[PDB]
């Protein structure tokens, strides 16, 4: 499991405070298209094995941390480079598209 499993004391160490690239993945148990996703973070965690590192939020556990960074629907892909918003992205999206997201932003 190379996913990090975020919550609101633990955002500024785990991914404010890291060196290098953190997705953080905003989401919630009620939506879909969030659980759509989490198969897919799995497959990214592990093709972007020491390129980035996966999160994840999960917003009504953690109601205080998402609106810091006005999200505002779920899930939000938000792609930090040392603790800076470097990318975003709402709603779902597949494998290649993320890949996409990803390799672009990450260059």
């Given at each position: 499991?190379?996913?990090i499993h975020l919550t609101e004391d633990s955002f500024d160490t785990?991914?404010?405070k890291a060196d290098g690239?953190?997705?953080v993945d905003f989401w919630a148990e009620?939506?879909?298209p969030c659980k759509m996703i989490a198969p897919i973070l799995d497959e990214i965690?592990?093709?972007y094995q020491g390129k980035l590192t996966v999160a994840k939020?999960?917003?009504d556990q953690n109601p205080g941390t998402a609106p810091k960074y006005g999200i505002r629907g779920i899930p939000t892909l938000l792609l930090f480079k040392n603790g800076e918003v470097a990318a975003t992205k709402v709603g779902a999206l597949s494998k290649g598209q993320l890949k996409e997201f990803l390799d672009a932003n990450l260059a």
């Open positions: 499991d190379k996913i785990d991914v404010l690239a953190i997705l009620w939506c879909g965690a592990d093709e939020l999960n917003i």
